[PDB]
Amino acid sequence: DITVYNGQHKEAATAVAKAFEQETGIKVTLNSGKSEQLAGQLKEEGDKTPADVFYTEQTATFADLSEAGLLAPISEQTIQQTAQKGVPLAPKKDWIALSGRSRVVVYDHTKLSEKDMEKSVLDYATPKWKGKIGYVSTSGAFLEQVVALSKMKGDKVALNWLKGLKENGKLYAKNSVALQAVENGEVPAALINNYYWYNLAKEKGVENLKSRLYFVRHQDPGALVSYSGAAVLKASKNQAEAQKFVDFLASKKGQEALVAARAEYPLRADVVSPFNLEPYEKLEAPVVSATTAQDKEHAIKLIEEAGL
Numbered sequence: 001d002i003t004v005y006n007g008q009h010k011e012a013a014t015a016v017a018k019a020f021e022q023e024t025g026i027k028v029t030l031n032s033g034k035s036e037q038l039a040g041q042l043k044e045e046g047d048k049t050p051a052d053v054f055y056t057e058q059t060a061t062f063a064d065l066s067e068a069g070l071l072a073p074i075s076e077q078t079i080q081q082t083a084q085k086g087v088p089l090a091p092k093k094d095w096i097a098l099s100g101r102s103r104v105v106v107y108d109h110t111k112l113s114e115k116d117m118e119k120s121v122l123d124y125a126t127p128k129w130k131g132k133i134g135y136v137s138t139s140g141a142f143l144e145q146v147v148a149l150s151k152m153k154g155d156k157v158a159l160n161w162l163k164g165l166k167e168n169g170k171l172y173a174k175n176s177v178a179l180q181a182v183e184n185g186e187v188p189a190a191l192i193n194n195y196y197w198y199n200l201a202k203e204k205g206v207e208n209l210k211s212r213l214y215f216v217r218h219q220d221p222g223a224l225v226s227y228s229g230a231a232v233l234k235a236s237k238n239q240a241e242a243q244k245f246v247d248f249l250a251s252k253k254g255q256e257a258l259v260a261a262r263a264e265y266p267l268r269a270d271v272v273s274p275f276n277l278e279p280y281e282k283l284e285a286p287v288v289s290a291t292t293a294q295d296k297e298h299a300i301k302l303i304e305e306a307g308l
């Protein structure tokens with residue numbers, strides 16, 4: 001039996017854990033919480049942690065743990081299974097990307113059409129969108145968006161964007177809350193990840209949603225796709241089963257289990273999401289290097305400088 005610290009959405013972890021149990025008869029116990037609270041906890045517990053695996057929304061979250069030598073190496077063969085365009089690889093082979101989540105602009109299509117959308121994510125952080133664009137400054141992918149802007153456009157551009165959001169944007173606590181604000185008609189548009197929308201559309205039926213997705217494309221920083229992944233803890237006693245689980249998550253069956261439950265992009269070439277996602281290739285996502293521990297701190301610094 002294994003214990004998985006879970007910084008992913010509960011629906012995601014439950015789905016993959018259930019599938020793994022059916023497949024192997026190995027029981028999975030989830031410890032769910034905020035990604036950075038769990039990351040902090042794993043560092044504190046160190047070699048005494050009861051965690052066998054850490055599953056989370058953003059591979060960026062693994063950076064500190066890897067530097068602290070807390071993660072166990074994964075088979076290179078497993079890593080190669082999910083290595084697609086734009087996917088980051090762990091330099092120490094001690095974590096693995098598993099699913100893609102695209103940055104998107106969700107908008108109220110009863111109020112706006114694609115003709116009203118911006119060609120660049122930079123264009124939303126302006127007086128034109130004063131009180132009309134939702135953003136989530138505490139979101140993991142939001143932080144990744146900031147890193148990508150810094151890397152792609154430089155710090156001045158990234159800083160002015162953030163200042164533009166502080167002045168013109170409507171702050172929401174979570175992506176889920178932002179999406180609902182658009183559906184409820186409290187804001188015409190918001191910057192979130194793609195899966196929230198497809199999952200809502202499955203529940204309620206697209207015809208009953210006001211919101212639709214806009215993809216900026218053309219390798220714009222707002223076309224960023226970031227990745228969720230998993231790592232095995234070096235401290236794990238259950239190494240056999242922990243590695244088996246992470247392996248499983250990269251397998252055709254483990255990937256199929258995730259995409260059935262959650263509208264994230266599979267990273268295996270032989271798996272098709274039942275959600276009818278905008279084809280990865282049509283996204284025209286830019287490629288960005290992996291977020292280092294230092295990249296992370298730097299982006300947090302810009303957020304603070306901007307007054308967020």
Ligand SMILES: [Fe+3]
Binds near residue numbers: 175
């Ligand atoms: Fe999320």
